[PDB]
Every structure is written in structure tokens, then in C-alpha cells.
Amino acid sequence: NLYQLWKMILQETGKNAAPSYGFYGCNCGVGSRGKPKDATDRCCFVHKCCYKALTDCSPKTDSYSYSWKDKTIVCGKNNPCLKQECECDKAVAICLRDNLDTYNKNYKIYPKPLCKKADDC
């Protein structure tokens, strides 16, 4: 669910996901995909594409189980759709964390409607 996604992002990046990534670039947080403004944004493009595989579960409201080991995310015992979902969230939290020397506070709150239309997943 959203709570788990947000917790992972906080755990991996050290930032609160709502203010820091809820409106970032053309892809992070609210709204649809768009042509990515940078690497942080790209993590979010891939993540929204990853959510396209969730045929029988809602990434927003369906809870999955995962553990947060010594700085490590491990997706738990889940049904197949929730497995996919957790792995989507895990990959975005690790991806965001990974490009943190490129995060652009200018993109934090982006005029998403002006974005170039997104390529096909």
C-alpha cells in the first residue's frame, strides 16, 4: 500500500516521500507518466510502468508484508500480485536513493500538465 511505499522511500532515501517526491518531475507521485526530467524522475517512470502489472491488487490500498533488515529491504510472504507490488516499491526506493546526488529541488513541485507525453511502457 501507499504507507509501505512511503516508508521504504523514507528508509532508503532519508526523505519524507510526500513533500519530497509527491509532485516531483513528470512522473513522481501524483498524476500520470511523462518524459522524465532526470534520473530521480526516471525511477518514478519505471515504477508507474511496474504498477501496470498489478492485475488483481491495488498498490494504493492493499497491504503487503516486507522487512527492513540492516539497511536492507526484503519482500515477505505475499500472494503473487502483492509480491509484484512490493518488488515495484522496493525498486523505486532503491532507485531514488541511488541518484541522490542528482535530485533537483527545482523539480520538487513540477507543473506536470506541461510534461512531454510518456513513452510506452
Side-chain angles (χ1 to χ4, degrees), residues 1-41 43-121:
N1 59 18
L2 191 54
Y3 175 85
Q4 279 125 27
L5 168 67
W6 280 2
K7 197 166 36 154
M8 278 185 186
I9 292 170
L10 176 68
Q11 283 165 165
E12 287 283 2
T13 74
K15 15 240 265 157
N16 296 315
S20 291
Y21 296 107
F23 324 70
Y24 184 114
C26 284
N27 291 279
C28 297
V30 310
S32 313
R33 289 167 320 113
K35 243 174 247 199
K37 308 292 310 195
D38 58 12
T40 280
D41 206 17
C43 301
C44 295
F45 185 99
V46 168
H47 187 243
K48 287 181 158 72
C49 278
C50 189
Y51 270 6
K52 290 219 199 284
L54 310 189
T55 55
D56 307 272
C57 57
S58 157
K60 176 163 80 274
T61 59
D62 290 322
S63 170
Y64 51 78
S65 72
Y66 81 93
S67 75
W68 163 255
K69 299 195 308 110
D70 8 7
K71 265 308 242 145
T72 321
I73 297 163
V74 176
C75 286
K77 191 204 203 337
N78 295 127
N79 69 79
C81 191
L82 293 186
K83 288 159 43 245
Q84 302 259 181
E85 197 187 289
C86 178
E87 294 282 354
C88 286
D89 292 354
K90 167 161 169 202
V92 75
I94 285 178
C95 186
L96 262 20
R97 152 226 213 26
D98 278 339
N99 301 92
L100 239 197
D101 45 329
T102 281
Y103 182 101
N104 185 331
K105 91 168 311 166
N106 283 324
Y107 293 156
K108 206 216 315 244
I109 304 172
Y110 203 77
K112 289 167 173 308
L114 304 165
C115 285
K116 285 217 184 72
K117 311 155 243 145
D119 277 349
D120 184 43
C121 288

